[PDB]
Amino acid sequence: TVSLWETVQKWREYRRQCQRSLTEDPPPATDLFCNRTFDEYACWPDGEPGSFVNVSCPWYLPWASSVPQGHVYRFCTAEGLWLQKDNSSLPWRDLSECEESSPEEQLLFLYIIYTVGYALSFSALVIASAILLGFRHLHCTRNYIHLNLFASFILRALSVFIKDAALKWMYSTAAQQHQWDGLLSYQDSLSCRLVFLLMQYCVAANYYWLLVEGVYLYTLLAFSVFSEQWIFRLYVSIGWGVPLLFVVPWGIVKYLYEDEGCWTRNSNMNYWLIIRLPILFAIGVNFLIFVRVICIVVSKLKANDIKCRLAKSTLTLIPLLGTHEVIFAFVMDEHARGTLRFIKLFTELSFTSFQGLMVAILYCFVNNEVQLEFRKSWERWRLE
């Protein structure tokens, strides 16, 4: 659709055309005529006395295509005046033939929920990262993968806070005025393109650290030996490096071919796919890994409340691997419209915002090996 900057530019061009045009236009040289005038909304040609001067609906209007023919009106009275309206120093002008004919209420309901969730996830994960890094008995390869997943969730929350601030600065009265007058704005700056590019990276790195947790749990349960320093340095390389390998390329495409809006708008869906297709491979492999691990858990429960233990194992594996995204993942942005957009965006935003809180509870706070370190440390605090 249309931006402030297209409409401002267009207007500036109309303003240029009327500015010249008024000098070019020739006087009717009759009595009681009205002067030609550009009211900042219209170019009004000089007017005949006692007549409706009927000017075409303007072309800069963002709603112009829907109104191919239309005429704004101003009355040139027979005594040499534009007709003043009732108790108005401004002349009478009728505009209803040139107007346009709530979606924000559900965007506000969405924005409130994920910011409460991301805040509670950021709060629980700075505590959960402090507990795992605090006790040295908890230091192992599993908790090292956990701490990097903790960091990938905190960065996503911080980027969501920064993106929301940026949207409110890009769409401020001050910014709007800056665009209307044509002075440089936030929307035209590499500091604005990097805020949303960092959002891409922190989202994609979080999905690939949910991927590392799947692959590392799959490696342990596949029972064959691996090198604990080369595979772990590969896991840190997979979790942080692979996202740079496809976020950096999607930034080149937006800069060369789609550099409008600070990269906040997906206009060509193929460029969109560059970020999303790479992220759906990581969700899909995490879903298959989720199947094999629960298939292992079922096989162990047969040998040794069976449905209740299996359900508890499933619901705590669900935030570790991000398998809640498998539901509405193939309902693509291109095809998702109406109430289905709401519910795809509702379930994805809300559960992802609360997913960092769940992983802090289930893998730090209720963890039995963590709770034994708090009780042995209080046992060593009863010797003081």
Partner: peptide, 30 residues
Amino acid sequence: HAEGTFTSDVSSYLEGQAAKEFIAWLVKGR
């Protein structure tokens, strides 16, 4: 992903609301 989808949806909606404002300031006499 849903972050990008929500950000694009917010920025495309708020792009059109500011254009309506611009036209309204123009109608007020700017």
